[PDB]
């Protein structure tokens, strides 16, 4: 399954390769621009726009890569690797969705065409001023979906399936829905990023070998985002919101006072 | 979470500390004031006001501090300085809401609060005093008693850390609301703050002279886990369902194991 | 109480950190712009815009700070570089904002601070060499728009106003959800956010000068009058305190053994 991270928004990954690599601002310069304008709209308990759901998973995915990169620095050079291969990818996702929130949807799509002809022409007949976008923070990933990360701390560590076992569930059930140019739900917008957040993390975990604590620290965090959004699409949206409450009272009761089988999720 | 126990009444905790610290009466003058006027109403099985639900837990939380302060003095002064000022304000504000109205005391904290602030030559000569001229049960207004909650086993109720974060994962945006959504919410806002100042005293004696945290969890931590489990379940499953759960589960643990249903009764949606 | 000067008008403090420090024109070149375009409206007794109420107090905040900087130059050159780095730069923003919001409208500045954000975030090999500058659409009485004058409040004696800490605690206890809110709700709240923040800069400078107890009898008294007048305008209404000020005038002007010994207290 090959998921284009911005295909629902009108762009492609190769149309956005019109811009050079060293055109996007730094992640320090992108996260502060996000928090200066959209702070109460990013910490909001509802999804105002499909860029807002896409930007929330992009900020949190950089939080995982920075937690992973400084981990292997303890156990100097990996920061030079992460800022060239996948740190550039987060800079594309942060730049695109910030400039979609500010300067509309179609204006930044017309900007990639208007930059696509500026960089293309020879330097003799090029204007000196490149085209630029003219006149018009700890977030919770489940916050617009109703649950919190505290509510999913009641589920034990072995309740979730494997991450390879969970990509196969989404790739079989919802493949032509996740690889579509539409959204069709705010869950598919959030689910498409968690595929690539794990996909752009496993290439770092493959490169760092040339030990595997990732499957209890970062992978357990991605097995929650995969399970919550698959079950939000399969067994309804609010049925899983009331299932976690019913699992909350089961896991809180001590042994010899609860039924021995955990409550399953169905219908 | 940070819960303000005046927030649903229109007042804030910094509007109450607008006044001087020594203005509020003693706990003995305030507890016998509420017993002289509302002992026939605080012991009643109805709410009749959201101030009565807040006042029943404010008296009971002071009884929990005066069962721990007697224990830490006996098994080796601080309460009246820190915890005593916070309990004198809850008794003063809730009595004066029931006696003089809720809106008059809110315009009294503003008017008297600027009266100290003005210089003593350009202010009115006298302070503008306000005049329009006991054993209680925390479940009795809800339907249960202490006896029905003790009918269930003592180690049935979960840990205190397991119950605080359930409220923070289900009703954090409703416990910190400026509106009392239910009398279960008003009785629950006091219980988080009662355990908050109960544990705050326990860390101070832990640094002063751990036996005390083993003592609190026996007879005070168990008493907190009762109404923390009770008010969370009554918000989730309804008050008319938890009362049947205590009856259903209470008979189930008493019957012999060969003639009971094989799994314990549990509440769910 | 952490009050914010721009949060009422739409922007924030950190959103104005998009622009660098050395972008704003000097305090000399900004006051020459204000007096050239808005002098018949800044000195007018009307409430013409909430930018005018914030600009009337921002000039007099600098007019009181420069007095303190001139005063410490005698009774000890090392303070001018301080008052141009921490203050100065903090008041160059508040003067640049309300002049440019009066001139080009308020919503154009908020789309300009974003548009200078994208010009400053891009690497220098791809941004244009031209900045995205915007070009398309004297003494001030601080009480005159509200009804009173300075000399009407000189009749109240120096031992009549409470201290600044007693008058700032009255603010955060009575009006804190209305001062910190992003709405105006009155011309008094807008004039009260600046008087609190101007005291934040005076006590900051007075601390570093002592690293000076005349501040609360030459400049703190002007803050004690401004904080008293706007708290009383919200507590008792505006007409009542203006009617009380003429009733203190006929009291404090009569000699002793002809006036009642009790001052005419504010009521209602």
Residue numbers in the entry:
A (entry chain D): 1 to 75, 195 to 255, 285 to 358, 375 to 431
B (entry chain L): 1 to 76, 199 to 255, 285 to 360, 372 to 431
C (entry chain E): 1 to 76, 195 to 255, 285 to 358, 375 to 431
Reported in the publication:
We have developed a modified HBV core (HBcAg) VLP, termed VelcroVax, with surface expression of a SUMO-Affimer. The genetic fusion of these monomers using a sequence encoding a Gly-Ser linker ensures that the genetically fused pairs will dimerize within the assembled VLP, termed tandem HBcAg (tHBcAg). The genetic fusion of two monomers results in a tandem HBcAg construct and the introduction of an anti-SUMO Affimer into the first MIR of this tandem construct forms the basis of our VLP capture system, VelcroVax. In common with the wild-type HBcAg protein, the modified VelcroVax protein assembles as both T = 3 or T = 4 particles, composed of 90 or 120 core protein dimers, respectively.
Notably, as a result of the tandem arrangement of VelcroVax, the T = 3 configuration does not conform to icosahedral symmetry. Each VelcroVax subunit comprises two connected HBcAg monomers, only one of which is modified with an Affimer, generating an imbalance between what would be true icosahedral asymmetric units. As such, this configuration was termed T = 3* rather than T = 3, and 5-fold (C5) symmetry was imposed during image processing rather than icosahedral symmetry (I1), which was imposed for the T = 4 VLP. Freshly purified VLPs were used for cryoEM data collection, and structures were determined for both T = 4 (at 2.9-Å resolution) and T = 3* (at 3.6-Å resolution) configurations. The T = 3* reconstruction was less well resolved than the T = 4 reconstruction, likely because 5-fold symmetry was imposed during refinement to account for the unique symmetrical arrangement of T = 3* particles. Both the T = 3* and T = 4 reconstructions had clearly resolved density for residues corresponding to the helices of both HBcAg molecules within the tandem VelcroVax sequence. Unsurprisingly, given the presence of flexible linking sequences, the SUMO-Affimer, the second MIR, and the internal Gly-Ser-linker lacked clearly defined density. For both T = 4 and T = 3* VLPs, maps low-pass filtered to 10 Å revealed additional density above the four-helix bundles consistent with the expected size of the Affimer, confirming that Affimers were likely present but were not resolved to high resolution. Because of its unique symmetrical properties and therefore much more limited chance of success, focused classification was not attempted for T = 3* data.
